[PDB]
Amino acid sequence: PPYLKWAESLHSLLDDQDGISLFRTFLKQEGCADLLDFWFACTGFRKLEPCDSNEEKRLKLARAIYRKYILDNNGIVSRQTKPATKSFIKGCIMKQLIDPAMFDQAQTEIQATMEENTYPSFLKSDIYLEYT
Amino acid sequence: SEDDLLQECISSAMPK
């Protein structure tokens, strides 16, 4: 049963659209869906190839992710990412040197944040319990 | 820079 696999690893949960939907609903109610959106945004950004034809799209995307989740140090993603990590990202943005893996560290920190609090809480939530 | 651009990016990373 898919729902059982989701309790074995966060990666299993996020590899299932029903799992993602349920988990995002839970996060939304807890006021932190940005954690998951950001996680997927980094993955989506990274899979874009660094060729000339994608240059403009990639820069606009990198800026968008930065502006919404990294810029203001008050959002939940920004609050859960390290100063040095955000500094490096800002530098990539300003220099316009945006390697596909530039958000990797931030993504790892946010992934840990979910594994540490919201993921476990989700598995013990009414939403999950009801679904199962 | 754009929620719509972020949404397209997020969608591309979804399973299936």
Side-chain angles (χ1 to χ4, degrees):
Chain A
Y3 77 76
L4 280 181
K5 293 182 180 179
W6 307 339
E8 280 173 35
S9 175
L10 176 58
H11 282 298
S12 294
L13 176 63
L14 304 182
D15 182 53
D16 184 311
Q17 283 211 48
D18 297 307
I20 294 172
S21 176
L22 283 173
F23 187 40
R24 193 177 188 288
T25 296
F26 172 76
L27 295 173
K28 185 181 67 65
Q29 303 190 324
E30 294 298 290
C32 50
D34 280 359
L35 294 172
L36 187 60
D37 292 349
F38 176 69
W39 190 82
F40 280 99
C42 293
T43 294
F45 171 80
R46 185 175 62 238
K47 62 187 296 184
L48 295 171
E49 292 187 46
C51 55
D52 291 326
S53 58
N54 289 168
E55 192 179 359
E56 294 134 318
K57 174 181 287 191
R58 296 182 64 251
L59 179 57
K60 282 189 175 182
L61 180 52
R63 291 176 177 172
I65 297 176
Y66 157 70
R67 290 182 190 170
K68 180 158 181 56
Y69 307 105
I70 306 300
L71 185 54
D72 191 322
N73 309 301
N74 192 59
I76 192 175
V77 169
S78 178
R79 299 199 302 275
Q80 295 293 140
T81 56
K82 300 301 184 180
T85 295
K86 290 183 286 189
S87 297
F88 178 75
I89 291 176
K90 292 178 179 174
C92 292
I93 298 296
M94 306 315 151
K95 297 176 177 179
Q96 299 199 333
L97 289 177
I98 56 173
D99 182 277
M102 69 170 282
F103 290 106
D104 280 17
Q105 181 53 45
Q107 176 178 44
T108 295
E109 284 164 19
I110 291 306
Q111 185 173 298
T113 299
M114 291 192 281
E115 297 187 302
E116 302 298 356
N117 185 190
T118 52
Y119 173 46
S121 296
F122 169 67
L123 297 178
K124 295 178 286 188
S125 70
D126 296 305
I127 296 184
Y128 179 65
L129 268 45
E130 167 63 301
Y131 183 75
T132 66
Chain B
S1 288
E2 190 66 0
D3 285 337
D4 274 15
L5 178 55
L6 288 171
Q7 292 184 58
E8 308 180 326
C9 174
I10 291 170
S11 168
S12 72
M14 288 290 141
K16 309 173 69 58

